[PDB]
Amino acid sequence: QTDGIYAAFDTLMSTAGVDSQIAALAASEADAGTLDAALTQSLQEAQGRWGLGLHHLRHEARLTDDGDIEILTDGRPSARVSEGFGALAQAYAPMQALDERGLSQWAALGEGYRAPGDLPLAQLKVLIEHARDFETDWSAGRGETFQRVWRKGDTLFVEVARPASAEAALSKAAWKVIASIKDRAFQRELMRRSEKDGMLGALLGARHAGAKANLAQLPEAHFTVQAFVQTLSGAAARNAEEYRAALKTAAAALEEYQGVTTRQLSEVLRHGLRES
Amino acid sequence: QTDGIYAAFDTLMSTAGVDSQIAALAASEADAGTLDAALTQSLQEAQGRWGLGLHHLRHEARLTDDGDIEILTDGRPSARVSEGFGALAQAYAPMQALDERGLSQWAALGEGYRAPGDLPLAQLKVLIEHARDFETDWSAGRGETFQRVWRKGDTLFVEVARPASAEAALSKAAWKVIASIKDRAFQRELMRRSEKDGMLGALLGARHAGAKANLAQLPEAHFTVQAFVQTLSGAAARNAEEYRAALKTAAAALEEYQGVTTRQLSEVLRHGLRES
């Protein structure tokens, strides 16, 4: 039950590509404060990736009195791990202002001016080199990606995101999965199913009874990687070349992480299919 | 005609993610010995990566009397580059002993004891630390992967492979390509056609008449990434943690390289012949 909670927290962190290793640290029995800090930092790192737009909220994670884990935003205890990942999803839901494209409209520095939808590199360079604090809105990028950047104190954040709802991640995963089936007739059957069911429903005829409940039990039914954040500091926070290099490192990183999540979903879905 | 030879070699090595750079090497006026050394190194890399099961043979590649390139397997010329890629594939065919899963049945150290494919890790660590020479048979890894390991003298090899015949990789890439389609009617019609003509052929059905023929002349028509080999030396070859880390590294590299092959192949099919 206690091990279950750490395992569930690790599974939650894995939806962000975060190798949190919380269970191992709790097993090694370090002081409680170190556990607190590790939980909080891993949670913030995953927060920067889930694509939730909550850069204006302070996310904290701590141990509860009965052996649970408490997740809090701006100091308010939002949820607990035992409640279930879906509960966390609902708790985080009201804080969003996502637009039609799946890109958050909430600001990171809160009240204050925001740069327009995009700026030429010439003006952006001046902003990085000579401004104090600022935030720019999403600007269209290569390969359906979107990007933004903003400075908090001496630390510069660059977020690159390709929005995709949980069902969308699952659908991409399955749409790639059904191609590799090593059975022409069974593949024909699934392709026949698709026309009416759509990849998701079409695939939930081979997964055993309660398949939708067999996948909703997993965190990925509500969470998946949508974005990646790269942080610079010092003169790096103020060098155009470093900004671009971080963008490339990081955009390739988001591509990598989304590919990894799709592969994980493909593996999960694959279980219980060929035998049917 | 000479330049085409080096370009073809470079493209053939790109089928295994090996940036040969032989064209640039010969261009920079390197001696025949250096050309031969680079050729053999790159060829052996691609051999360990193609998953053909012929690690038990020493492969060579040299420049001939007429300005061509001759490939030798234990000193017997199999084919020359100009002869064609399919020629080399059919020349490699007789020495293969691929089983029903598509994995090499040949031994790697020649005749001798081979550990079972289910050997518990506890005994395996003992083997790595204390044996002199050893080799295990294939044992299944996660996600339809397969892994084997063997030490020769001072060098430890770990091979991770997932079976994929060239044509199968083409089929998967075509699956992706049609998955990206936006016009529903076109998608449905192509999926219908594939049920009879094969997905690759269905996709090729919408292109220049060249299409099939021109694709057949490309390196990918007969070669694809099926395996990766990671090599350790020295005391690292007798360290359990190093073995586990190397297994993880090899699996990750397999995933990365296969993903790159899939993406590049999908785009290539998307545009394709462009023979000029």
UniProtKB/Swiss-Prot annotation, chains A, B:
Keywords associated with the record: DNA damage, DNA repair, DNA-binding, Phosphoprotein, Stress response
Post-translational modification note: Phosphorylated by RqkA in vitro. Phosphorylated primarily at Thr-64, and to a little extent at Ser-104 and Thr-136.
Gene Ontology molecular-function annotations: damaged DNA binding; double-stranded DNA binding
Effect annotated for changing T136A: Slight decrease in phosphorylation. Lack of phosphorylation
Biotechnology annotation for this entry: The PprA protein combined with an immunofluorescence technique can be used to visualize radiation-induced DNA strand breaks in mammalian cultured cells, allowing the evaluation of DNA damage responses. This detection method could also be applicable to genotoxic tests in the environmental and pharmaceutical fields.
Coiled coil: none
GO BP term, pick one: cellular response to gamma radiation
UniProt modified residues of type Phosphothreonine: T64, T136
PTM annotation (Phosphoserine): residues: S104
Mutant phenotype after disruption: Cells lacking this gene show a reduced growth rate, do not exhibit a decrease in the efficiency of natural transformation, but are much more sensitive to ionizing radiation than the wild-type strain.
Control of this protein's activity: Phosphorylation increases DNA binding affinity.
Induction profile: Induced to high levels following extreme ionizing radiation exposure. Also highly induced in response to desiccation stress.
Effect of substituting S104A: Slight decrease in phosphorylation. Lack of phosphorylation
Top-rank lineage group of the source organism: Bacteria
Keyword DNA repair set for record: yes
Reported function: dsDNA-binding protein that contributes to the ionizing radiation resistance of D.radiodurans. Plays a role in DNA repair and genome reconstitution, and is necessary for recovery from severe genomic fragmentation as a result of exposure to severe levels of ionizing radiation. In vitro, binds to double-stranded DNA carrying strand breaks and stimulates the DNA end-joining reaction catalyzed by DNA ligases. Thus, PprA plays a critical role in a non-homologous end-joining (NHEJ) pathway for the repair of radiation-induced DNA double-strands breaks.
Protein's UniProt name: DNA repair protein PprA
